[PDB]
Amino acid sequence: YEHVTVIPNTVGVPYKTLVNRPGYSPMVLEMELLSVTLEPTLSLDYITCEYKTVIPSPYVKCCGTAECKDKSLPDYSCKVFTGVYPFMWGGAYCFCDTENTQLSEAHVEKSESCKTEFASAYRAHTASASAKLRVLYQGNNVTVSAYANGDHAVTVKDAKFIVGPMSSAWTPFDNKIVVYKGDVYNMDYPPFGAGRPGQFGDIQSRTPESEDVYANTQLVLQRPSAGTVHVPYSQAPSGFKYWLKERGASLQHTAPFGCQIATNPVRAMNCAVGNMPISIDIPDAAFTRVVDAPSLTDMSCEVPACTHSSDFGGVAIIKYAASKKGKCAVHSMTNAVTIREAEIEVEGNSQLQISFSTALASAEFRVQVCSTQVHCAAECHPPKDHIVNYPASHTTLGVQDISVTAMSWVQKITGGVGLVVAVAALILIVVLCVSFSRH
């Protein structure tokens, strides 16, 4: 048949399922997803690389005074300082002292750091639901990797399949996200051309090869004192000297749902929430008839000892009588019980065991074998161990959890006062009729 089902998008848990083909042994099959890999939409906004102040060699206007020509430079600064006096070994480089002025000009540009040291302010929206799943189809571990969309079904070895697409379209990412080569940060940046002087990303450019450099360094050139033949000036704060300290934890630790990080490109990893539809058609060559199945009689199952652990702390014993030799589809019909074994070779009047658990103490349950219902009881126990280093499988339950003798206790307490309400009813009718006995 074709069979379509939806598994909960849960990383690292074996999903067993029945594929009913009536008139045939129902193809119970096990498949388990491995990767949940999202990739948001590719849209670079701008770059932030480490600038440098470019102070060109200034102009000592000896015995004269000039003007202040303005060039189109980011954070341009120029000033004709009067009263200057140059020093060298010979002292006065200019001839006199008084009339010597000096032009001072500086600005900021990019550095050679920007070929590798930069950070992309980046726009991120809806992602690509890519994933990987391994199906143990009939002793055959076949693992595939594709994107969950709805149309791109891929087919290998009698098995077509389209995973997904993802229902719960939650992403860890938002629109504003800044990225450096080892670390991503879903933070708001100022937009391009909007950097406040001295801020995070105060120097702004589009690419590492854009010649446009939006810069903001609030710079101002102060006056040299005397003979200090240089450019004393203010401070141009780099954001990159504090591009590390504000980071804190990165988004490998801010993500919920166990979601992790892959760089270049940035894939969200194994972020288990929601559910994924898979739909697989296999034709009848994988389906064995019920009359071609060895029919089991004597469905006498029991358990030596069960324990509602995390792992398969129950293992039950099936004594049985098949008709002949051949495979048998063994299956847990109820989600409370998870058999870890797909199909077993059955011979006839023989006995074997089955590995499973639930999370409750008294599991009473009907297994399905060669399309055959079998009831079996199981007293499980609270397991001795306490820390578990792995999530469990069968423990996905609710509150209506059956018990050993609190069934009998709740039967004991519902056999309480309602009988006295029946007594109350007989007292009520006997006091009614005697009041009606007057007339």
Partner: protein, 52 residues
Amino acid sequence: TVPTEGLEVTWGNNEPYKYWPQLSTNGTAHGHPHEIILYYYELYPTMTVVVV
């Protein structure tokens, strides 16, 4: 403190660790007395304690 979800802990350059509790197991009995608060202290303690 480990929640019912489980807890990640990372320490230094080495890879983090992911942890899951059990059902608050081994506080258990049935008995000729009640011992059903025992079974409750298995069966999700301190939530739906109010129902009994």
